[PDB]
Design a protein around this motif. Structure first.
Motif, short mmCIF file in Angstrom:
data_model
loop_
_atom_site.label_atom_id
_atom_site.label_comp_id
_atom_site.label_asym_id
_atom_site.label_seq_id
_atom_site.Cartn_x
_atom_site.Cartn_y
_atom_site.Cartn_z
N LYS B 38 0.79 -1.16 -0.06
CA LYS B 38 0.09 -0.06 -0.14
C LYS B 38 0.79 1.43 0.02
O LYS B 38 1.93 1.26 0.44
CB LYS B 38 -0.89 -0.12 1.14
N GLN B 145 -3.93 -9.51 6.37
CA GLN B 145 -3.94 -10.92 6.08
C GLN B 145 -4.51 -11.54 7.32
O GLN B 145 -4.87 -11.09 8.36
CB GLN B 145 -2.41 -11.44 5.95
N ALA B 150 -7.66 -17.81 13.14
CA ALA B 150 -8.52 -16.78 12.96
C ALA B 150 -7.93 -15.64 13.26
O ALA B 150 -8.39 -14.63 12.82
CB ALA B 150 -9.76 -17.03 13.89
N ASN B 151 -6.53 -15.66 13.76
CA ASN B 151 -5.98 -14.49 13.90
C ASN B 151 -5.64 -13.72 12.71
O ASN B 151 -5.17 -14.23 11.70
CB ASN B 151 -4.55 -14.66 14.63
N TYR B 152 -5.84 -12.28 12.58
CA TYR B 152 -5.55 -11.72 11.57
C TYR B 152 -4.51 -10.40 11.88
O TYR B 152 -4.50 -9.94 13.20
CB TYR B 152 -6.76 -10.86 10.93
N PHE B 153 -3.98 -9.72 10.89
CA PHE B 153 -2.94 -8.51 11.08
C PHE B 153 -2.99 -7.81 9.97
O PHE B 153 -3.93 -7.86 9.24
CB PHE B 153 -1.62 -9.03 10.75
N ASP B 154 -2.79 -6.41 10.47
CA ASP B 154 -2.76 -5.31 9.81
C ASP B 154 -1.31 -4.92 9.34
O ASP B 154 -0.26 -5.10 10.05
CB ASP B 154 -3.09 -4.03 10.55
N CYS B 155 -1.02 -4.68 8.04
CA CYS B 155 0.47 -4.63 7.33
C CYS B 155 0.43 -3.60 6.57
O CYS B 155 -0.37 -3.14 5.77
CB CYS B 155 0.43 -6.21 6.52
N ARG B 156 1.85 -3.21 6.59
CA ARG B 156 2.34 -2.28 5.75
C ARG B 156 2.35 -3.05 4.17
O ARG B 156 2.05 -2.45 2.90
CB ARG B 156 3.57 -1.75 5.94
N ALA B 157 2.82 -3.99 4.19
CA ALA B 157 2.83 -5.05 2.93
C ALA B 157 2.86 -6.42 3.44
O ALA B 157 3.18 -6.76 4.81
CB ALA B 157 3.95 -4.67 2.06
N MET B 158 2.62 -7.34 2.73
CA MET B 158 2.56 -8.69 3.21
C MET B 158 2.59 -9.57 1.82
O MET B 158 2.16 -9.21 0.82
CB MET B 158 1.47 -9.29 4.03
N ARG B 168 8.69 -11.28 0.79
CA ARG B 168 8.76 -10.67 2.23
C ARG B 168 10.06 -9.87 2.42
O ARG B 168 9.83 -8.56 2.83
CB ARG B 168 8.47 -11.40 3.36
#
Lengths: 217, 239, 235, 249, 241, 239, 240, 229
Positions: B38, B145, B150-158, B168
């Motif tokens: 992003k 991602q 069920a764990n999710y993350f917020d990413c600059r990139a992935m 990566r």
């Protein structure tokens, strides 16, 4: 794999010979041998009651308390009975080999299921291999008899003062006679057990996977 | 041995690890790689598609949930399709009820709950698919991602999928410039990143690349085989 | 390993419990069906009287409706359930569409029921295969077969149950347009085919015919005796 | 290895072994017998319970009346038997409510056999470990005797026995039973004979058996249990006849 | 050195180590038991062909239905379990007619394939409905139809995944038949050439000598509807070869 | 074996070993509770052990109030104890709602115990690994003491103990009732404390024990303060 | 031994081992601590930064389960998020029915009972999360509660969860939280987290803090970044 | 083998072995004795307590289902109470429907139907208890037994629990149909006296009787008076 017509012919010849020989053996040879061994154990020689009839002279000069030993023969009775028995045990081993190969060639392609027929084939194979080991045990003990008796008489001649070696020679002969009659009994029993198991389970043996399905596929 | 403790999700292991969930997390590794990155004004999804054969068309790796959200999948296409249907219905429900685009963070929270329910109960398996969710909302561009856990993350990139560690590390060493990039620069960076994952013999093509872009002025659009050629042409070559 | 549940596929993708049910069908008494030009004949062997048993209770051949009948080889209770369900479906179809059932429709329904029992665990497949015979509206003879798996196939002539392989080989040899020319010839063909695998001729076969627009007729034992006598004499 | 569990798995060679194991159970049961005659049909059973401190409070331990026009005797698990008899009575009364006619014998047997098949097919429940004989008169087919098994399969029999020594009972009945020539008295004598042969006790106690007869009198079926005096007379007559046959030789 | 423990293949809803979910893979192996089917997409149309695999002469050849009509615009060819194939064909037909009812238009081949695929996906049992088969559908379908985009051929598998394919082969000899497809196929070929090439490949793979009885052949062209080659038309083409 | 590991299946000796294991679960806690009845009072005592200083001593308690005039002490799993306490409170309030009067102690014990029975008969759930002892005053019968166990046995008692030192404690109490002269309130509390202290060897301080009482004069269940507990303790040491 | 396979089972010695195995889950987690003082409750979490790619302010382990209460979790994050949804539902239902903000003791009891439901039944596993709850209300006061995977619930003057629980607990023990105030407690929480963090095993961490108290007018909230930076600088200075 | 664990699985030779195991659970239960006299029927069982601390008045092993029916058990105490509540409920349902006291035979049929209902499902276990259900209806006494299997039998006199075989032999030696209940209670306490392995007292046993009046539990003073002999 690519096969020549000659190669296919040779393989089919071995297969048809094996199948027809197995059929002939179990249907004809097995009953004949069962009755032959039955009458043989019914024979008077195998049913000797007084074992001292069997013991044979060992002309070892007993040592007087303070010249040479003549030719010491083998027990005529035991060696004659052995001459009768040895063809039968070798014949049974040959026929068990034939049965093993027949069943093994009848084993089908390996497959995930409908393995009950091949399980039956494996069980009858287990039984025939067991009797194969048993007859091999018979075949080795018949030689063990001669080697042991020869060693025993050599010991008795070398050490005349020991009488236990002489008693041992007589005991080897008696034990040999007992083993031989048990042997012919077991040979007849093995022939009969082969007949019974094969005749009972022949359908699954010859056709393990079974008739073709309706083919839902 | 420890073949036990692996049979079902409902069995804890003697060291506090649910092995079926981890075995599900292995599923994402099986799929073809995907990369997302992003900028301040845009969010991008790029994918490497695979084909069963030369005659067969390449599979669909990027799916549009809504104008403001779209996803890319790594792992089981079945679970991907199911979760995409759930997400689409959630967004439609939000638009019907509140007449606002659903927040992307809230959507991934819903995905996390729905995905979590299988892991704890006996029965349905964990969703053995990993998704990269990219969207623009009032807060800004976002990339998330979601794991088969069920764990999710917020990413600059992935990057997710097979051989994604190479992408990566490329992304991490080049991350600082991404934020101020143009959309062309950003898609080019992501394309190089997924190019890292490819085998050395293979190279990026019009066929096996799909690009997904969303931004303040741009609704989610998947640029297909013909349309990726403007973005691909800029890239120079393998190093 | 892979043979204990209906749902589980095996390596190489064999569902084995349905195969085992198809094997269970083979245990059952033989049945044979043949399509004559104007007759469909359905013949089933009879196991034994036992001399203290009433023959009327045991009947393998049954009429689903006026224009359709079936015979079965397999589990008798399962056959009874399937027959009743097909009968109620026949009357329900007449209720719904004001028309008599077609043979392919009823065999489709029976197959769908058997399929429904295969697909889900907690239910075992119906251990039956059936031979459904009827005349359609056009008047063409129809013969269909069903199995526990749920596939159905039309057959010019077929057999199910024990000795099905042998009798169907005989029928592949014997069957021709010439044999189907006469109704008596069709009946004699099926009787000879059952004679190929049965202990005794007249006592151990129960046979029935459906004509173009008549109800099912179970042939009398005297009629079967006459037909086997005609068959026996010609040899 | 094991294809005998859960009653829903066809074993290789296509056999349901749970129902066969259930059929094994009825063999342990007390012998029950039924004979069909021109004028009537009877049920005779061996009261396996011969404990001294038991009371004969009920109509019968084994014989049950299902309807005005029929009865049954049961061999197998008593609890499943009670359930099946309750279901039978409800089925008969439902038919009477619907059609205002008595339930046909074959129809009632068929309904219960459908239940018994259903318990085989679905996974959780066990098959009913019961086999029971039905006797009844219906206008369509007159006097009828029916047998059922755990499999849900039934048949019509002129005479049959279920339970312990059923094979011996059937072997004796085969030679003795005269087709089209039986009367209720002769059938009762035959029942006493085959029961004496099967039952281990040298003398049938007349408290170790229960006999019931179904007859049509004055246009109405009557199901009657022979009282202890009647069965005492029957065993006395059989003993006298068998001894006289012995005395001649 | 053999490690054959598997111990995870049994039972769907179990991710084995490396997360492979082997029941579905075994179902995908299952279609190789089925008769070979073959599809070629061309500008003039899409053709479908399959080998019937008649067991006995007495069986009626017409009854074997391995190519069927979902609608005039779409037809299907199947290889694998006939029963669950019938189930999926029913789903396809009802969905096409539902689309006609609701929107007064004809579905695309992709949409129909997605519709059946959604049903195939339900082996996972995410839904609470009892009437969904626990096992995956042991069948692969080839969906061929002329839509707004022209002739299209879609492939469907037990997983429920679906893709367009210019030419595909399913069934036993799919391996090797696909290589023959890859060499022969060029996008420009007319439907006549496609029919001939597909029948050549089917003749190669089929154990029995090819005859009008043992094959089923169909084509849907833009002007025409779904059509099955009759005995006479099949005779003409198999003579031409 | 395999005859354990499921509550439903019976042993070849018909013993249901799983519930017997649930009985061991009570002793696994390492705490003991004692209840003794008196002519005009009933008391419950139990050990109070704070593993960490950081724990708020007020929060940790095994004495709960099912209703205004009934009190209980739970021994076993803390969570199962709290759940059974909640179920008991619900049963008491529902009894009051339906029948218009306060639930008798015996009927409360019977309800909880038959619930424990439905647990020990149905397959999927497990018996709650806890033991309850209820004390209250009934106008007709005077003081009452009752105990539920994981099996469903609910017998009433003159005096009882539960926990690790149950056998020692009931041996002690059995001697004291055998030399029966009476028990007033002070002697009742002293008997309880002496039993617990003797079997444990603790020689308690006021913090280490928590006591709850009911009396015909004041029917409400009350948990005595540390000062009251120390008052009773000092009286014990003085004599 | 098949006793440990399911939670319905009991060991022959009276132990339900699946629950203990689930308790071992939280120890895998990075540490989190919550300290209660006179003014209010302060929470802190050592949120390990697994990758530079991950955004800051992501993988939050501090949740707001209602306006007046906050939740800090250790163990499986999926189970923790689900438990947070459950707690939020319980708080909303309490407000809707009884007309006021839920007491923390009651909320802890309800979520603990919900957790304890899962240990009983065989179909469903115990939760893999241990979490702390904290609130301040002028009536109730400062309250800190911790719930284990079992459903045991207790009130703690200071509490720690996760990998470094024991070391964090001794460091918290030598603090005298009762007299202290929140704006100092944030600094000491930062100190304790920086102490227990293992630089060798764990590459880096971003301190995540929250509090509730009178200073918020009884609203749980994330720390203002200035106060975060001050506490972090103090922790680095004290670490030496 | 697998037959042992499952309840819906017939073993080879056709045995539902879990039920046999439940009967073994019954056999371990305390002795209980039932004797049907001409004018009454006595139910007796030992109420041996682990300690003096136990309060005998709290719980009873002999319970009335109705005014004219009462029962006693040998086996599992909790299962006993589940079915005693269900029996009372069934009797009240009968009274609501027919406005007559339920016959003893009908009640034992219904509770046995319940017990059978439990055995079929795999998710549940059989009731590990057997009952002796005694009643007086139509100016006649009744005694019945209902086993875990769901079967019921009618006994003139019988015993359950420990040493039930020896107790039954003692009974058949001592039993006379002409006995009045005044004698029958003596015979019952003797039958239990065979098998206590302790000095019986008023507390250690619980006994009840039925007659034209109805079921009652005769008090500790009453059983002391009868024990004095």
């Amino acid at each position: 794999v690519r096969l020549s017509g000659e190669a296919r012919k040779q393989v089919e010849v071995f297969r048809q010979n094996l199948f027809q020989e197995a059929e002939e053996f179990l249907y004809r040879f097995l009953p004949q041998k069962i009755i032959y061994l039955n009458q043989l154990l019914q024979e008077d020689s195998l049913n000797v009651a007084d074992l001292t009839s069997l013991r044979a002279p060992l002309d070892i000069p007993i040592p007087d308390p303070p010249h040479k030993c003549g030719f010491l023969p083998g027990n005529e009775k035991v060696l004659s009975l052995l001459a009768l028995v040895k063809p039968e045990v070798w014949t049974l081993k040959e026929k068990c080999i034939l049965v093993i190969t027949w069943i093994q060639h009848l084993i089908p392609k390996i497959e995930d299921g409908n393995d009950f027929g091949v399980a039956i084939q494996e069980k009858v194979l287990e039984r025939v291999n067991a009797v194969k080991t048993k007859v091999e045990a018979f075949q080795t003990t018949i030689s063990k008899y001669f080697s042991e008796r020869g060693d025993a008489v050599a010991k008795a001649s070398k050490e005349t003062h020991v009488m236990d070696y002489r008693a041992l020679v007589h005991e080897r002969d008696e034990a040999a006679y007992g083993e031989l009659r048990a042997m012919v009994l077991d040979l007849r029993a093995f022939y009969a057990e082969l007949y019974h198991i094969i005749s009972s389970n022949l359908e699954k043996i010859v056709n393990p996977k079974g008739e073709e399905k309706p083919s839902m596929y | 041995f420890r073949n036990q403790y692996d049979n079902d999700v409902t069995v804890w292991s003697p060291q506090g690890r649910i092995h079926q969930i981890e075995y599900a997390m292995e599923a994402v590794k099986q799929g073809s790689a995907t990369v997302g990155l992003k900028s301040k004004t845009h969010a991008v999804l790029v994918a490497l598609k695979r084909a069963q054969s030369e005659l067969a068309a390449h599979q669909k790796k990027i799916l549009h949930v809504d104008n403001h959200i779209g996803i890319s999948i790594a792992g089981l296409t079945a679970d991907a399709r199911l979760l995409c249907n759930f997400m689409r219905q959630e967004c439609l429900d939000s638009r019907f009820v509140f007449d606002r685009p659903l927040p992307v963070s809230r959507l991934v929270s819903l995905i996390g709950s729905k995905t979590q329910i299988p892991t704890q109960r006996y029965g349905r398996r964990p969703y053995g698919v990993g998704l990269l969710i990219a969207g623009y909302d009032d807060m800004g561009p976002h990339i998330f991602q979601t794991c088969p856990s069920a764990n999710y993350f917020d990413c600059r990139a992935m990057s997710i999928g097979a051989r994604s560690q190479s992408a990566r590390t490329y992304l991490e060493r080049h991350m600082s410039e991404f934020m101020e990039c143009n959309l062309n620069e950003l898609v080019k960076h992501g394309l190089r990143a997924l190019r890292e994952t490819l085998p050395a013999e293979q190279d990026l093509t019009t066929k096996n690349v799909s690009i997904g872009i969303v931004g303040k002025d741009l609704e989610f659009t998947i640029y297909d085989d013909d349309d990726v050629s403007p973005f691909l042409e800029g890239l120079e070559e393998r190093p | 390993s892979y043979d204990r549940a209906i749902t589980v596929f095996s390596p190489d993708g064999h569902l084995f419990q349905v195969e085992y049910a198809q094997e269970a069908v083979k245990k059952g008494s033989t049945a044979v069906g043949v399509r004559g030009r104007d007759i469909v004949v359905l013949g089933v062997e009879k196991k034994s009287v036992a001399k203290l048993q009433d023959e009327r209770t045991v009947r393998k051949i049954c009429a689903l409706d006026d224009n359709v009948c079936m015979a079965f080889a397999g589990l008798t209770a399962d056959a009874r359930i399937v027959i009743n369900r097909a009968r109620v479906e026949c009357q329900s179809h007449r209720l719904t569409v004001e028309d008599p059932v077609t043979v392919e429709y009823i065999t489709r329904y029976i197959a769908s029921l058997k399929q429904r029992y295969t697909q889900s665990n907690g239910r075992r497949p119906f251990g039956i295969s059936a031979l459904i015979v009827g005349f359609d509206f056009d008047g063409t003879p129809r013969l269909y077969q069903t199995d526990p798996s749920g596939t159905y196939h039309a057959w010019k002539a077929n057999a199910i149950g024990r000795g099905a392989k042998s009798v169907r080989e005989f029928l592949e040899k014997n069957y021709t347009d010439e044999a189907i020319e006469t109704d008596d010839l069709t009946i004699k063909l099926v009787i000879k085919a059952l004679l190929e695998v049965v202990q005794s001729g007249g006592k151990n076969i129960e046979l029935a015919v459906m004509r173009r627009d008549q109800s099912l007729k179970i042939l009398n034992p005297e009629e079967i005796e006459k037909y086997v006598a005609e068959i026996e004499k010609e040899k | 290895r094991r294809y005998d569990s859960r009653t829903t798995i066809f074993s290789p060679e296509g056999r349901l072994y749970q129902v066969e194991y259930a059929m094994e159970a009825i063999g342990h049961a007390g012998t029950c017998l039924g004979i069909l005659a021109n004028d009537g049909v009877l049920l005779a059973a061996e009261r396996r319970n011969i404990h001294k401190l038991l009371d004969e409070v009920f109509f019968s331990e084994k014989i049950y009346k299902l309807n005005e026009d029929m009865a049954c005797s049961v061999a197998g698990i008593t609890s499943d038997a009670n359930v099946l008899t309750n279901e039978l009575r409800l089925i008969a009364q439902r038919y009477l409510l619907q059609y205002q006619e008595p339930i046909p014998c074959e129809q009632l047997v068929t309904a219960l056999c459908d239940i018994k098949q259903a318990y085989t097919q679905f996974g959780g429940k066990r098959p009913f470990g019961v086999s029971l004989l039905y006797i009844g008169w219906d206008k369509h087919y007159g006097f009828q005797l029916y047998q059922s098994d755990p499999s849900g399969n039934y048949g019509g029999w002129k005479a049959t026995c279920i339970g312990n020594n059923s094979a011996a009972a059937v072997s004796m009945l085969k030679q003795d039973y005269k087709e089209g020539e039986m009367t209720l008295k002769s059938a009762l004598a035959l029942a006493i004979k085959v029961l004496n042969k099967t039952m281990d006790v040298s003398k049938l106690s007349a408290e170790k058996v229960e006999i019931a007869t179904l007859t049509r009198e004055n246009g109405k079926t009557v199901i009657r249990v022979l009282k202890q005096k009647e069965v005492e007379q029957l065993i006395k007559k059989h003993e006298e006849e068998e001894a006289k046959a012995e005395r001649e030789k | 050195m053999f490690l054959t423990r598997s111990e995870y293949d049994r039972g769907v809803n179990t991710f084995s180590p490396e997360g492979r979910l082997f029941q579905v893979e075994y179902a995908i192996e299952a279609i190789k038991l089925g008769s070979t089917a073959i599809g070629i997409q061309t500008s003039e149309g899409v053709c479908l062909a399959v080998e019937k695999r008649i067991t006995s002469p007495l069986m009626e050849p017409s009854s074997i239905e391995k190519i069927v009509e979902i609608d005039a615009h779409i037809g299907c060819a199947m290889s694998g379990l006939i029963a669950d194939a019938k189930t999926l064909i029913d789903k396809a037909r009802v969905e096409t007619q539902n689309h006609w009812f609701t929107y007064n238009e004809t579905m695309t081949v992709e949409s129909v394939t997605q519709a059946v695929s959604n049903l195939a996906l339900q082996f996972g049992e995410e839904d609470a409905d009892p009437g969904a088969m626990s096992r995956p559908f042991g069948v692969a379908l080839l969906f061929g139809g002329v839509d707004e985009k022209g002739p299209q051929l879609f492939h469907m598998d037990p997983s429920g995944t679906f893709v367009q394919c210019d030419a595909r082969a399913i069934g036993s000899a799919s391996e090797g038949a696909q290589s023959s497809l890859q060499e022969v196929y060029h996008k420009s070929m007319t439907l006549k050439e496609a029919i001939k090439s597909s029948l050549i490949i089917l003749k190669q793979v089929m154990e029995e000598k090819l005859n009008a009885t043992n094959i089923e052949l169909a084509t849907v062209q833009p002007g025409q509807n779904f059509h099955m080659f009759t005995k006479e038309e099949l005779e003409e083409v198999i003579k031409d070869i | 074996a395999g005859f354990d590991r499921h509550i439903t299946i019976f042993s070849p000796e018909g013993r249901l070993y799983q519930v017997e294991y649930a009985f061991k679960a009570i002793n696994q806690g390492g705490l003991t509770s004692v209840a003794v009845r008196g002519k005009d009072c009933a008391v419950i005592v139990t050990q109070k052990k704070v593993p960490d200083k950081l724990l708020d001593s007020s929060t940790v308690t095994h004495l709960f109030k099912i209703t205004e005039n009934i009190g209980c002490v739970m021994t076993g799993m803390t969570a199962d104890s709290r759940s059974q306490v909640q179920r008991a409170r619900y049963e008491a309030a529902n009894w009051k709602y339906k029948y218009g009067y306060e639930i008798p102690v015996d009927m409360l014990c019977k309800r909880i115990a038959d619930i424990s029975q439905v647990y020990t008969q149905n397959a999927e759930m497990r018996p709650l690994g806890c033991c309850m002892i209820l004390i209250g005053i009934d106008e007709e019968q005077g003081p009452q003491v009752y105990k539920c166990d994981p099996a469903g046995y609910y017998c009433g008692f003159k005096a009882t103990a539960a926990g690790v030192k149950q056998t020692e404690s009931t041996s002690f109490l059995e001697k004291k009732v055998k030399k029966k002269f009476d028990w007033t309130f002070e002697q009742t509390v002293e008997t309880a404390i002496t039993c617990l202290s003797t079997v444990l060897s603790i020689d308690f301080k006021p913090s280490e024990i928590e006591v709850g009482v009911v009396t015909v004069e004041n029917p409400k269940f009350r948990i005595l303060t540390e000062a009251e507990i120390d008052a009773h303790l000092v009286a014990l040491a003085e004599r | 031994t098949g006793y440990d396979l399911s939670a319905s089972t009991f060991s022959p010695d009276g132990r339900v081992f699946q629950v203990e195995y689930a308790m071992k889950a939280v120890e895998n987690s990075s540490t989190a601590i919550g300290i209660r003082c006179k003014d209010g409750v302060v929470f802190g979490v050592e949120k390990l930064v697994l990758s530079k790619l991950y955004e800051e302010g992501s993988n939050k382990r501090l949740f707001n389960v209602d306006r007046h209460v906050g939740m800090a979790v250790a163990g499986l994050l999926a189970d923790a998020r689900s438990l947070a949804d459950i707690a939020r539902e319980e708080a909303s239902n309490f407000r809707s029915n009884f007309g006021y903000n839920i007491p923390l003791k009651h909320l802890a009891d309800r979520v603990a009972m919900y957790v304890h439901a899962y240990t009983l039944y065989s179909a469903v596993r115990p939760f893999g999360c241990s979490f702390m709850l904290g609130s301040y209300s002028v009536n109730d006061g400062a309250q800190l509660y911790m719930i284990d995977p079992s459903g045991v619930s207790y009130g703690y003057w200071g509490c720690a969860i996760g990998k470094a629980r024991q070391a964090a607990k001794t460091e918290i023990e030598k603090l005298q939280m009762k007299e202290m105030t929140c704006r100092d407690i944030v600094k000491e929480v930062a100190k304790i987290i920086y102490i227990v963090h293992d630089e060798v095993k764990d590459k880096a961490f971003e301190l995540e803090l929250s509090w509730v108290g009178e200073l918020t007018n009884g609203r749980h909230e994330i720390v203002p970044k200035d106060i975060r930076e001050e506490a972090e600088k103090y922790a680095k200075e004290s670490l030496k | 083998r697998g037959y042992s664990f499952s309840l819906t699985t017939f073993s080879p030779s056709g045995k539902l072995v879990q039920i046999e195991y439940a009967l073994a659970a019954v056999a371990g239960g305390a002795p209980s004795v039932g004797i049907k006299a001409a004018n009454g029927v006595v139910l007796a069982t030992e109420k041996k307590q682990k300690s003096i601390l136990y309060d005998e008045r709290s719980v009873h092993k002999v319970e009335p289902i109705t005014k004219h029916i009462g029962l006693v058990y040998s086996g599992m105490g909790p299962d006993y109470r589940v079915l005693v509540h269900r029996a009372r409920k069934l009797a009240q349902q009968y009274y609501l429907v027919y406005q007559e006291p339920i016959p003893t035979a009908q009640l034992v049929q219904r509770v046995a139907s319940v017990m059978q209902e439990y055995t079929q499902s795999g998710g549940v276990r059989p009731f590990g208890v057997s009952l002796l259900i005694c009643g007086w209806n139509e100016g006649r006494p009744y005694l019945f037994q209902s086993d875990p299997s769901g079967a019921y039998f009618a006994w003139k006199a019988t015993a359950m629990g420990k040493n039930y075989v020896n107790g039954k032999t003692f009974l058949e030696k001592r039993y006379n149909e002409d006995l009045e209940l005044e004698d029958a209670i003596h015979t019952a306490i003797l039958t239990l006296k065979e098998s206590f392995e302790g000095q019986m007292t008023e507390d250690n046993i619980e006994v009840g009787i039925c007659n034209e009046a109805g079921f009652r539990r005769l008090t500790p003073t009453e059983v002391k008076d009868y024990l004095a002999a």
